[PDB]
Amino acid sequence: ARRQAREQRIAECMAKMPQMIENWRKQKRERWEKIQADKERRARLQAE
């Protein structure tokens, strides 16, 4: 019973793992966007 309970929980978590990884990958993308959203996209825009 322990092995099956251990195995099934991993399967469910692994099954949803791709979506969570995509989300984590997604967030960091937007985080970086904000970095250049003002570093050059806005700050330099006025410096013109």
Partner 1 sequence: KTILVKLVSQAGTGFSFNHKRSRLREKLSLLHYDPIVNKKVLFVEQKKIRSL
Interface residues toward partner 1, by CB under 8 A? 9-14, 17, 20-21, 24
Q: H/E element holding 36?
A: helix 2-39
Which one, 16 or 41, has the nearer CB to partner 1? 16
The rounded distance, in Å, linking the Cα atoms of 15 and 21 is 11
Cβ 39 to partner 1, closest distance in Å? 19
Which one, 9 or 39, has the nearer CB to partner 1? 9
Which one, 33 or 40, has the nearer CB to partner 1? 33
Which regions of the chain does DSSP assign to beta strands (E)?
none
Amino acid symbol at 20: M
